[PDB]
């Protein structure tokens, strides 16, 4: 059974026409993992995999553009379990130290807001999941994926941090925000240029980096190039559709 | 200057694959009103007409399939500040009888919560807007909205009720939720049927009769045959894209 993820949305804050925000399709065998659940992320999800052949969905952080679709995912499970597509419950994992946002995971019997520990390794099927604590105005947390063979760090949202490397050791795949470009400074905003996101990849030893949480302005291309100064690996701009297996 | 729907999202609880829940846009000459704002909604509206050319937004409840976008809008605002595309505040309408959901409609400079009243008619830029509460779980408003020579209603979400036909009357376009089919009641979750949604438009004596909210079972087709046995006029099913004029 390989590791395959397949991006779903990937602008950051908001949309651009036709495309969508954070998530990303976690599949190993036949498990279906959501990472992040943000505008757009259902509609496009949908044409991948239907709302109850999801085993579950882990958030990184609650901003809108991680989260706006988690309500009408709630929907789309009560609909679901009154059209007899199978009574199964959902589990929603997040961080609880926002007490408000994480109640709003759990709703009738459709989905269950389960607390992850940023201490300690989560067990989602065929996945372990392990925590970094990252640099961002809301707390928020980067995900290391492995299913035991592969390994995917998804940096979630974050202005950069050393950590980050050890954090993303050997791994086969980084995903990496990129909300700028390497003439500017993400500090303020909590957020990594292409230089910082090559730095990751180059440092930990990545097998190869995909730039995410993109701008709504410049050359994305240029986003590739400036990371390819520093990262000798393969790189690539998210899209909607984009597919990585190992 | 004509009065331009386009339908930006139409199914009813959560998207269908690549498409879209509630969310209509109302054009007259050089202004753009966004009614709903549901899943996928700003990802397809983008296509029509950019976060700054928008001029206003008005919500007609506070389920999920009607302001899951809300958060991205006020972030693609907030963006839209940062690179000198809009410094204008974006007004949202809504009720303000649920008062946590209004407060959450302004954020910063960037969008500004503004309360309609149900019993006074609402003034947005050419538009008028007037409002009947609805019987869904909820407070909800369904909305007859005119630029002087046309009329548009839109059902919101809603069981049946005799006073819609008053509140549709001559209207041009009638826009009714229809997310059940002929021989169901969707009475228990504040819905209405294809026959339901022709009565209104039936007797109320519309121009057109456009069936939305759509349902996820089904032929979506057997909705607009149903609504033809009761009225007469041209009926369609709502997709993203559909344009009345
Ligand atoms: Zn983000
Ligand atoms: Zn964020
Ligand atoms: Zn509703
Ligand atoms: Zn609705």
């Not at 998530?23 to 999800?45: E, I, P, T």
């Not at 970094?132 to 928020?140: A, E, F, N, R």
Request: hydrophobic share 35%; aromatic share 10%.
């Amino acid at each position: 059974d390989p590791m395959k993820v397949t991006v779903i949305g990937c602008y950051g804050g908001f949309p651009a026409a036709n495309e969508a925000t954070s998530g990303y399709l976690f599949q190993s065998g036949d498990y279906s993992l959501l990472v992040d659940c943000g505008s757009a992320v259902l509609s496009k999800l949908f044409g991948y995999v239907p709302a109850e052949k999801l085993d579950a969905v882990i958030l990184s952080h609650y901003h809108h553009d991680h989260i706006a679709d988690i309500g009408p995912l709630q929907f789309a499970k009560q609909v679901g379990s009154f059209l007899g597509k199978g009574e199964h419950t959902l589990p929603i994992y997040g961080h609880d130290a926002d007490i408000e946002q994480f109640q709003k995971l759990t709703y009738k019997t459709h989905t269950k807001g389960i607390a992850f520990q940023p201490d300690q390794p989560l067990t989602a099927g065929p996945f372990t999941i392990t925590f970094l604590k990252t640099i961002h105005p809301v707390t928020c947390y980067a995900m290391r994926i492995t299913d035991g063979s592969h390994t995917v760090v998804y940096t979630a949202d974050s202005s950069y941090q050393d950590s980050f490397i050890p954090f993303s050791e050997n791994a086969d795949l980084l995903i990496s925000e990129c909300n700028f470009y390497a003439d500017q400074d993400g500090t303020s905003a909590g957020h990594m240029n292409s230089l910082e996101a090559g730095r990751i990849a180059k440092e930990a030893g990545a097998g190869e980096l995909l730039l995410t949480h993109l701008p709504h302005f410049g050359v994305h291309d240029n986003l590739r190039k400036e990371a390819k100064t520093v990262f000798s690996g393969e790189v690539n701009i998210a899209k909607s559709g984009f597919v990585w297996e190992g």
